[PDB]
Amino acid sequence: NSVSVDLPGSMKVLVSKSSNADGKYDLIATVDALELSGTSDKNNGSGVLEGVKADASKVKLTISDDLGQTTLEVFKSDGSTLVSKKVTSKDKSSTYEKFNEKGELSEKYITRADKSSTYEKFNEKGELSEKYITRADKSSTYEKFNEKGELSEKYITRADKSSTYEKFNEKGEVSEKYITRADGTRLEYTGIKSDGSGKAKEVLKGYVLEGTLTAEKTTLVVKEGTVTLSKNISKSGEVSVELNDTDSSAATKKTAAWNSGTSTLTITVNSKKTKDLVFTSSNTITVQQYDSNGTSLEGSAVEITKLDEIKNALK
């Protein structure tokens, strides 16, 4: 009786071989497990098919004359208030719209053939409330707008899966910023003031370092007894480390020297080197002891896995 015709979106339509009682051809398709039917002046698979869901929603499939596009609309039982609309082309691009109870646009998804995409959400006044743009390389930007139409949050994801999240205040200033590195470690800046100062945390494998942000740098601080270890991160991401001890006894006071070339802090007590702390390219810290003479490293460097081990190194 029928001939199967391939359509966009992997859809198929069955068409009658020869026109019915009038000059019309019969059409049947199943879309999302609902069987739709209609008739057409034409013989190629094009035309309009309709069905009704179990909840009385009306479904209308329009296949373009040249078979290059399908439009699938879902309406309320009135047959005219839109619930959703999906348009799909032979090149695999599509647009999908969702509507509110009044049949006004509430969400729109555009998917391109190269897999880039856009998503927009609109509020009850039809104003943009969210926008999410994804590029062909899978990087993306997601913005949320408040009721004043101003940017409230922004999340940027890069192709290498690093990302930045920013919250904005009523002055349009960044009030919080979370940076995830490509290795999964994180910087968290909170309570950021108009001078660009705020609280800072660095979230590492096994421990979190805490400190402050100023225009000049991020400074993360670990204290143990009278010793303060400070890890500085410059605006371009350069790490330097310093140590200060208020101990006044030659027997026990720590001092330290930083070698930028080897990213190593060498600690000395009573004119003898005691240990090297290496701040590695993997965002880890290793510790290695010197011999009793204070001149040669012994054993192997050991990776720090908890904050108490950093404090132990400072004792």
Automatic annotation (TrEMBL):
Localization per Swiss-Prot or TrEMBL: Cell outer membrane; Cell surface
Record-given protein name: Outer surface protein A
Family: Belongs to the OspA lipoprotein family.
Alphabetic keyword roster: Cell outer membrane, Lipoprotein, Membrane, Palmitate, Signal
Domain of life, source organism: Bacteria
One Pfam family from the record: Lipoprotein_1
Organism from which the protein derives: Borreliella burgdorferi
Membrane topology: Lipid-anchor
One of the record's GO cellular component terms: cell outer membrane
